Design a protein around this ligand. Sequence first.
Ligand SMILES: [Mg+2]
Ligand SMILES: [Mg+2]
Ligand SMILES: [Mn+2]
Length: 288
Amino acid sequence: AMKKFLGAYQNNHMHWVGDGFPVYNLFSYDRLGQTLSPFLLLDYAAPYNFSPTTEQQGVGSHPHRGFETVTIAYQGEVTHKDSSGGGGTIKTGDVQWMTAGAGVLHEEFHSPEFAEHGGLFEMVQLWVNLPSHSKMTPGKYQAIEAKDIPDIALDEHGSHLRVIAGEYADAKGAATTFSPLNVWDGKLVKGQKHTLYVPEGHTTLVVVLEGAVVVNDTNRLEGKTVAILSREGVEFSLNAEEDTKFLVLTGQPLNEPIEGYGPFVMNTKAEIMEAINDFNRGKFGSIM
Ligand SMILES: [Mg+2]
Ligand SMILES: [Mg+2]
Ligand SMILES: [Mn+2]
C-alpha cells in the first residue's frame, strides 16, 4: 500500500552552531520525539559564503554520548578532531558516520584548505539514535569517501540517489548501522517522477533541502522542509517541479525511551545524570 502524507514542517529561521555552521534545524527529537525514531536531529547549513580567513571557524570542543552524528559535505569541507587524537577531513561529497557511543570529545571546523580559499559552504548534520544495548559501545568513525558511495541513476535526465546507509536497487549503503535504517540523498531533476519503496512499518521522512517536489501526486513540498509519511505502507512517489536536493530517511522505530540533554541522548534521566557528571568532572578528556 501507499504511505500516506501526514504533515510537514518548514523552517526559515537560521541559528549559528559556533561561528562556522549557519544552520536551519529541520527537525529535532525535542519537538517530534518518537515520531522521528530512529532519527534525532537534522541541521542544514544552506549555501553560505565564507570569505578567506586565517581563523578556525566552526565549533570548539564539545561532547557527545549515546548516538551517532552523520556529517554530509555538499560544498566546502569540514575537519574534525577528537581528544583521542582521531578525526579527519570530510571533503565535498564525503560522509563521516561517527558513532559517539560511550563518548567522544571533539571539535568541528572548516578545513584549512576551505578556510584558505573561502566560497560557499553547504552541509547536513544528522543525528541518529542507537538502540539501548548499543549506546555504551566504544566511539568509532566511518570516514566514507565520495567515490565509495553507491550512486543510482533514477532517470536519464540527471536524477540520482546516493545510498549512504541501508539499501536501494540492490546497492548496499556505504555506512554500517546498529539498527535497520536507510539514509539516501540526491537530486531529482525538474519534470521527473519516481516511486520509492520503503520497508513496511518504517519511519519515513522526506527532507527537501532545496527545490520543490510533489509527494503522492497531491502534496507539494518546498525547500527547508521535512515531511512525515505513515509507518504503514511501503511506497510513495516524488515528482519534481524544480531541480530538488533531497534526503530520504527511513528506519525501524526503536520503541525505546528518549531522554536527551544538550549533546547527550540516553534512555533514562539517571543515564543523563551520569553523562553530566562524567563530563563535568573531566572524564571525557581534552583536545590539545
Ligand atoms: Mg527511473
Ligand atoms: Mg586546535
Ligand atoms: Mn559534534
